[PDB]
Every structure is written in C-alpha cells, then in structure tokens.
Symmetry: C3
Subunit: 217 residues, 3 copies
C-alpha cells in the first residue's frame, strides 16, 4: 500500500585477503589496503547510503560502486541484484566490520517507499544527518555534512526535485540525470540538517502529487 | 498481426512553472526558458517525433530527451515507460500549447508497426515531411526539410537501412548505432519528401523480409 | 545442473553482397570490404569468441560487435538476443565462409557453464590458444597470442578475477568493469597458453565457491 516500505535485501558477501597487485592497480587502492569486501543487493541507492554509513563505523573506503541495467526486477542471475559495492581496508577485520555495518543499515528500516495502492510508484527521500567519506566525496562536500538523498522515476524526480529546491535552503551537489542504470533519477542536495529534512518532505510530497495526478496538467 | 499499428501511450505529463535556477543550470537552459513541460511515454522514437512537431507551432525547445534501458516492457514503475522528454518555453501557457501538440501527434496514428503475427518484431518507418527545431538540429539539416525516421531491432535495422539507402536518393544524417538504450537501432536519412517516403517503404519491406526468414541462408 | 553447458543459440544471420557507400562509412569498412555478414545470438561473449575464430578461418574482419542492455532474457523483440556482430569481407564468399566458421564455433561445445543446481549462476572460462584479429585488438596484443576469456556476474567476477590473477603468470589486458551491458563482468588476460588455461581453471573454481556459499561468512 501507499507509504509501505520496500525492504531491501543483501544477496551476496565475500572478503578478499591480500588483493593481487594487478587488481589493486585497476581499483586504484591505497597502498596498505590489502583486503576487499564485496557486496551485492537488490536496491542500489539504499546500498550506497549503507556503504557510506560503513565508512563511519570502520576503517574502510568505498572503492567501487555501480548499478545494474534495468534494476533488480530484471536481473538474469541469482546474485546480481541491482548494485555491487566494494569496500577496501587494511585487513579482513576492518572489512568485516564495514560489511557488517553495511548489512545492518540495509536492514535498519531505511528504503524506498510506495506511493500508491499497487506499489507501482516508489521513491527514496532519505535525510543523511552525517555523511561518511563516500557520499561526501560523491557530492563534493566536507565529510560529516548533511545531505538529502532524493531518488524517483524520471518524471516524478524532475518534478519533485524542483519542489525540493524551492521549499528549502539547499543546493544541488550531484544530479542523477534520467536514466540511471535502473531507470531512476534524483539528486544529492546539501545544507543544514533541518533544510535537508524539509527538502525530503517536499520531494516526497511532490512525488505523491504526481502519483495522484499523473496526466492532469 | 503483421502491419498492425503498435499504439503509443502517454504515461505522465507535468508543467513546471518558474524552474529553479539550479535545475536550469544542470539542464543547461537558456535565460529565457522559464517553464518546463515534462512527458513520459511507452515509445521513445514516436515521442521524439512528437516533441519535434511541437516546436513548429509553439515557442518551445526540446532541452532533454533520453530513452530508458531495456525499453517499456522492462520498466519497473508505472510512469517510467521508455522515454522522458522536456520542453522549455517562456511561460507555462506556451509550454501547455506545445504539450497539447505533442499529445495530439502521439494520438494521430503514428507509431511502430508489427512485422509478424505475434508482434514480436516491430519497426518505425516514419516520413517526417517537415522537421522542427529538434530533429533538424540532431540531423544537421535546416528546419523545414524532410527526414526518414527509421528504427528497428539491431540486425533488421542494419539490413533494412542498407536496403533503404540503395532504394532512394537519401543521405545518412544521424546513425543510431546498435544498441540504443531500448536495444533498437536505425538512422535519420534526409532528402526530398518523395525520396524519404521511398526510403521508408524500402526499410519497412526489408524488416518484414528478415522476419519471414531470420536465419538467412541456413 | 551444476557444470552443465549453457547452450548458446544463434537467432538471425544475414549477408549483404554489396554494401552501399553510406553504410560502408558509418561502419568503418576497409576499401576492399565489399560484403557484410550480420549475426545475432543470445550469448554475447561466446559470439565474440566465435567472430574472432572466423577472422582466422576466412578473409574477414570484425567491424562491429556490441551487447544488448540487460541481456537476452530481457529482449523485447524476437531477434535482438543480447549481441550483434558484423563481419566484413572482400566478397560474399569470404563473408559466407566467415559466418559458417562463426556458427560452427558457437555450436562446438564452448559456452557458459552453470555454477549451481538451478542454473541461476553461470560463468565463462574460455582459453583462446591463438587469438584472431578481433580479440587481439580488443586486448592490445598481437594476433596469435593467447588469452583467458573470463566472465561472470559482478561479485563472482571480481572475486574470481582476483583469484585468477594470483594463480597464474598473466597480465590484465582488458577489464570488463561491472556492469557490462548484460550485467556481467570479467576481463581478458594474456600470457602463455598454459598460464591462460591455469587462470581459466582458477576463475571457474572461484565462481563455484561463491555459488555454493553466496553470503560468505554470514
Ligand atoms: Na524483464
């Protein structure tokens, strides 16, 4: 139903000890990050927020993060989902903590929200109180700064982004131009915490107004 | 069935009045673009032709037009379809006029055509008699000249484009190298309106022949 | 079943005896290239290896080869599959022989292998003893040099690729960063023939290790 959470699921996890030099060269790892933590899930933007959360609780960096074409509902293999993330750390112990932190956040109640009765429209309006090292880098903001993580299908996102930018004292940091690999869109907006929360509410309200009137104009 | 029109559908339409300055920045709008018209549909190339049609009778420009990965049949949400287009204009009233023309054109009988009984192969063979400001820009021609808008699945398109180029006095203006986001392909060919129509007929004929014998010499 | 070959299927094949000058340019054919051979299939990496084999058995070059977004399981039309390849040759006889070699290789037993009982995870671990003109150029090595052609889903590929690089005296030539158009990943590794084979076996074993315990320490 409307306002129901779409629960994200982690599909696969694996840890690498002593990465090969060739692979470290490709992934441009820091010299003393000898261990990697791999993870896939069925929801990309939640996983991106979870990976950033992991950099806050463990001595890890996000070195790879990409979404799959057409989303998790169209995956052709068991573990592909719609996202792959790679954490790098000095040893499997740090990587293990990061992966555990990632999984806990994915299971913490955060996620996309359904906008109508048949769950055919959904959106992501997440206020990140304190960014880690990954979303702050992606957004070009100081680590620890707040951001609103806003994602929705193409038209809803463009309409709702305009509403969010006008409703709150926020600035655009990164634009997810439609289509992402999953055929969504959105942005990362920064500002004070209260402003990011106001933007999340305006974004969510705007997406709902499209779902209750998709063609009326 | 063969020769059936695949009816295109508009999924969502919205007008943004007084677009925020940072949105105008990311979208690279011009200082006189004050209102936006958003549209999604379940058929991308038909919508691109309609948006271009809108630029002839109204003061709107096509500022954004992108297709969705794997097409409308693989959309995960109700309104994503397989295309998003954005018109920019001086006021919401002018944008409304442009969108009205876009909707009328999408409902005018244009669309993809089926090449076989189960509609598992389809193609687009549209003669654009008089281009607007969008397709003319994309093709590198002057506004008001004609185009043949030819789209089909990868192999059919490469074969049928070759048939069209031999059959009519046209030149290649824009090549949609396989795959597009929707896993189709094609091109924009220009010439006289009769040459463009001859190219459309030859393109449609070639796609149908491939559908009747996909494994060629086997 | 685990270790079962995934049978690849060719979906369409077509020859063009004499390509028009316009298609010849946009497809970047050599002046002596007069004919084209088109092919689509439901498995891209097997088809790429087959096209490369064709450049060894016939006087043909691979001039176009691309994968479809989201793979063959998500194709919207009958013949799109997940790959289109184009061979070019001096006459229809060379193109025909090239296509025959391509088809013979696709049906030769090479292919993706299932990693678990329900065939929900599969991988490609193919040792190319002597590359033709296509995969050699793709990897940046001389034709005739050997390659390990390793493909698997994103997480499996990264783990198994790292495993392969440790197990053999090979170097990374081309990295298929996840996701490819088909939402797979892998790389082309070069070295001695036995070294490339050692990497292939190590890659396959590592993928199977993830498939039998996807959640790892969890
Ligand atoms: Na699908």
């Amino acid at each position: 139903m409307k306002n129901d959470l779409i629960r994200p699921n982690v599909l696969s996890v694996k840890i690498i000890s002593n990465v090969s030099p060739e692979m470290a060269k490709k992934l441009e790892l820091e010299p003393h990050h000898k261990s990697l933590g791999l993870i896939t899930a069925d929801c990309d933007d939640v996983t991106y927020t979870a990976l950033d959360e992991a950099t806050k609780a463990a001595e890890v960096d996000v070195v790879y993060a990409r979404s799959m074409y057409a989303g998790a509902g169209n995956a052709s293999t068991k573990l592909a989902g719609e996202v792959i993330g790679i954490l790098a750390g000095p040893s499997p112990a740090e990587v293990r903590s990061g992966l555990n932190a990632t999984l806990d956040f994915i299971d913490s109640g955060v996620g996309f929200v359904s906008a109508n009765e048949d769950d055919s429209i959904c959106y992501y309006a997440q206020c990140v109180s304190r960014t880690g090292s990954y979303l702050s880098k992606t957004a070009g903001i100081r680590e620890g700064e707040a951001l609103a993580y806003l994602v929705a299908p193409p038209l809803e996102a463009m309409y709702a982004l305009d509403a969010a930018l006008k409703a709150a004292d926020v600035e655009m940091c990164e634009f997810f131009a439609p289509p992402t690999e999953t055929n969504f869109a959105g942005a990362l907006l920064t500002g004070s915490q209260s402003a990011c929360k106001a933007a999340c509410d305006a974004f969510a309200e705007a997406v709902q107004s499209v779902a209750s009137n998709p063609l009326g104009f």
